[PDB]
């Protein structure tokens, strides 16, 4: 799996169904900005 | 599943194995800040 540590949202991002992921993780997951992902408990 | 739209990282967050998730999504996923999650292609 592609695994990451959870951090809180920036203030301007509060209230969005959005996750901010840097380009290296996006490349490992196989997604681009705008794509939909599942965020799943490990 | 708990599903979210992918957005790019803020500049200060580039190069981290971190995903920023707001409190509502953290509550739905069942995790707290510092927890490890999987980010999975849908």
Q: Which experimental method was this entry solved with?
A: X-ray
What number of helices (H) and strands (E) belong to chain A? Answer: 1, 3
A12–chain B nearest CA distance, Å: 10
How many Å apart are CA A31 and CA B30, to the nearest integer? 23
Question: E strands along B1-42, which residues?
Answer: 3-8, 18-21, 36-41
Instruction: Return d(Cα B34, Cα A31) in angstroms, integer.
Output: 23
Closest residue by Cα to residue B5 from A41, A11, A16, A35: A35
* DSSP one-letter code for A32: -
A4, part of any domain: yes
Q: This structure's resolution (angstroms)?
A: 1.9
Q: Domain for residue B40, yes or no?
A: no
Both tokens assigned to A25 = 């993780």
Structural domains in chain A (count): 1
Q: What's the domain range around A32?
A: 1-36
Query: CA of B1 to nearest chain A CA: how many angstroms apart?
Result: 7
The dihedral sign for the CA sequence B4, B7, B12, B13: positive
Nearest to A3 by CA among B36, B2, B9: B36
Distance CA A28, CA B22 (A): 22
Contacts of A12 in chain B (CB under 8 A): none
Does residue A41 fall inside a structural domain? no
């Amino acid at each position: 799996k592609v695994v990451a540590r959870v951090a809180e949202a920036r203030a301007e991002d509060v209230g969005k169904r959005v996750v901010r992921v840097d380009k290296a993780e996006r490349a490992k997951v196989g997604v681009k900005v705008g794509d939909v992902v599942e965020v799943k408990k490990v």
